[PDB]
Design a protein around this ligand. Structure first.
Ligand SMILES: [Zn+2]
Ligand SMILES: [Zn+2]
Length: 64
Protein backbone atom coordinates (compact mmCIF):
# COMPACT_ATOMS: atom_id res chain seq x y z
CA UNK A 1 0.00 0.00 0.00
CA UNK A 2 1.94 2.99 -1.31
CA UNK A 3 0.65 6.52 -0.78
CA UNK A 4 1.77 9.24 -3.21
CA UNK A 5 3.09 12.12 -1.10
CA UNK A 6 2.60 14.66 -3.89
CA UNK A 7 0.67 17.79 -2.89
CA UNK A 8 -0.81 18.21 -6.37
CA UNK A 9 -1.55 14.48 -6.61
CA UNK A 10 -4.92 13.11 -5.38
CA UNK A 11 -4.14 9.49 -6.29
CA UNK A 12 -2.95 6.68 -4.01
CA UNK A 13 -1.13 3.41 -4.70
CA UNK A 14 -2.02 -0.17 -3.74
CA UNK A 15 1.57 -1.40 -3.43
CA UNK A 16 5.05 0.04 -2.85
CA UNK A 17 5.66 -0.78 -6.50
CA UNK A 18 2.47 1.03 -7.53
CA UNK A 19 3.77 4.46 -6.49
CA UNK A 20 7.17 3.81 -8.05
CA UNK A 21 5.58 3.02 -11.41
CA UNK A 22 2.92 5.69 -10.90
CA UNK A 23 5.38 8.44 -9.95
CA UNK A 24 7.97 7.42 -12.53
CA UNK A 25 5.50 7.11 -15.40
CA UNK A 26 2.96 9.73 -14.30
CA UNK A 27 5.10 12.38 -12.58
CA UNK A 28 8.01 12.01 -15.02
CA UNK A 29 7.38 10.93 -18.59
CA UNK A 30 11.11 11.31 -19.25
CA UNK A 31 12.01 12.57 -22.73
CA UNK A 32 15.18 10.47 -22.80
CA UNK A 33 16.58 13.03 -25.25
CA UNK A 34 18.77 14.98 -22.82
CA UNK A 35 22.56 15.08 -23.51
CA UNK A 36 23.59 16.07 -19.99
CA UNK A 37 20.66 17.04 -17.77
CA UNK A 38 20.42 15.06 -14.49
CA UNK A 39 16.98 14.53 -12.97
CA UNK A 40 15.87 16.03 -9.65
CA UNK A 41 13.15 15.18 -7.12
CA UNK A 42 9.89 16.97 -7.82
CA UNK A 43 8.70 17.28 -4.22
CA UNK A 44 7.67 20.59 -2.66
CA UNK A 45 10.01 20.25 0.33
CA UNK A 46 12.38 17.59 -1.01
CA UNK A 47 15.62 18.71 -2.67
CA UNK A 48 16.70 15.20 -3.68
CA UNK A 49 18.57 14.89 -6.97
CA UNK A 50 19.67 11.94 -9.09
CA UNK A 51 21.53 11.12 -12.30
CA UNK A 52 18.64 9.12 -13.76
CA UNK A 53 14.93 8.52 -13.16
CA UNK A 54 15.79 5.13 -11.69
CA UNK A 55 17.97 6.78 -9.06
CA UNK A 56 14.95 8.84 -8.04
CA UNK A 57 12.53 5.92 -7.91
CA UNK A 58 14.95 4.26 -5.52
CA UNK A 59 15.04 7.42 -3.41
CA UNK A 60 11.28 8.01 -3.65
CA UNK A 61 10.44 4.57 -2.31
CA UNK A 62 12.91 4.98 0.57
CA UNK A 63 12.36 8.66 1.29
CA UNK A 64 8.78 8.81 -0.01
ZN1 LIG B 1 1.21 10.82 -7.76
ZN1 LIG C 1 12.60 13.19 -2.66
Amino acid sequence: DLKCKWKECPESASSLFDLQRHLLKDHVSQDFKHPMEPLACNWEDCDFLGDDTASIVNHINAQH
